[PDB]
Design a protein around this ligand. Structure first.
Ligand SMILES: C[S@@+](CC[C@H](N)C(=O)[O-])C[C@H]1O[C@@H](n2cnc3c(N)ncnc32)[C@H](O)[C@@H]1O
Ligand SMILES: C[S@@+](CC[C@H](N)C(=O)[O-])C[C@H]1O[C@@H](n2cnc3c(N)ncnc32)[C@H](O)[C@@H]1O
Lengths: 157, 157
């Protein structure tokens, strides 16, 4: 009865250094808090493409991936959680008992349906961050939040 | 070479993926806005060490590297600039004409003198970020800010 953290993200080819950095954090998560990545393919964009519909198809794929999971969106206008707050949230998710889906939008951001479906929305920064860096920050900050919950040396070194 | 952006940062041994990611951004700044790294070595800490002094000695070195430059600290309680705001600031630094020293603290954070010396302070996140990731986020966000000022393709879509 341990909870799963699922990063649901649009885009499939992280630069090598980003994937290396992401894996170094992902792998340090304990067996009772598995951290896993689900990549959704980005819709093909063009001037002749209807951008709303491309975005909705992306969102539909994300929400389908989340299933019945608790839905948390990564979004610039979400809650600017500090590290103690994220640790408190991480603890709340565990009591809740449901797996958590963390949603990272593609180039055009999150679909309206995804923003609407969010039970919580989490802002990493007031800055517009590139999708690969969002992946790494989420992994690192959750790791730091987790290490606070178990008094692991990482959060205090 | 009108204004130079110099990152003054405590710590010397970045993980490889971090140096790769950091350089990837650094090498893309144009010759007329050079982005450079100055590393101050971290003081050797021990449970018998005077942290107050170690911190002062780090700051002393930082402030020496900055010289007469515009001094901007990276600090959690600084200004939570969004990306357009950072572009405007970058534009204001160019008008000022002074090179900009961007200060990143060591394991114990910035010295009292460095915080005192700051003309501006810049917050990347409400999160407690690890020193390597601060380096990468500063390089990318300034690169994105630069690309906005020059109507470069990086920041669009
Ligand atoms: C390049 S951004 C596109 C942002 C989009 N134009 C918007 O305003 O919603 C791609 C995705 O990364 C995530 N992201 C980028 N910056 C973020 C931030 N500062 N805080 C939280 N999530 C962020 C969001 O999930 C976003 O959908
Ligand atoms: C290990 S952190 C220390 C965290 C915290 N600022 C402190 O004083 O203990 C090292 C440095 O990274 C920078 N830093 C960490 N998180 C930051 C954030 N969210 N925004 C801007 N700078 C940050 C600060 O310059 C800090 O001195």
């Amino acid at each position: 009865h341990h909870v799963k953290l699922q990063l649901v993200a649009v885009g499939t080819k992280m630069p090598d250094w980003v994937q290396t950095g992401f894996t170094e954090y992902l792998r340090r998560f304990p067996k009772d808090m598995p951290f896993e990545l689900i990549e959704i393919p980005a819709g093909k964009r063009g001037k002749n493409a209807d951008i709303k519909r491309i975005l909705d198809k992306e969102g539909e794929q994300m929400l389908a991936a989340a299933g019945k999971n608790r839905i948390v969106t990564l979004d610039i206008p979400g809650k600017p959680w500090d590290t103690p707050q994220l640790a408190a949230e991480l603890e709340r998710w565990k009591l809740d008992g449901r797996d958590v889906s963390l949603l990272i939008g593609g180039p055009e951001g999150l679909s309206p349906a995804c923003k609407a479906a969010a039970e919580q929305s989490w802002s990493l920064s007031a800055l517009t961050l590139p999708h690969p860096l969002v992946r790494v920050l989420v992994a690192e900050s959750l790791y730091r939040a987790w290490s606070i919950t178990t008094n692991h040396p990482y959060h205090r070194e």
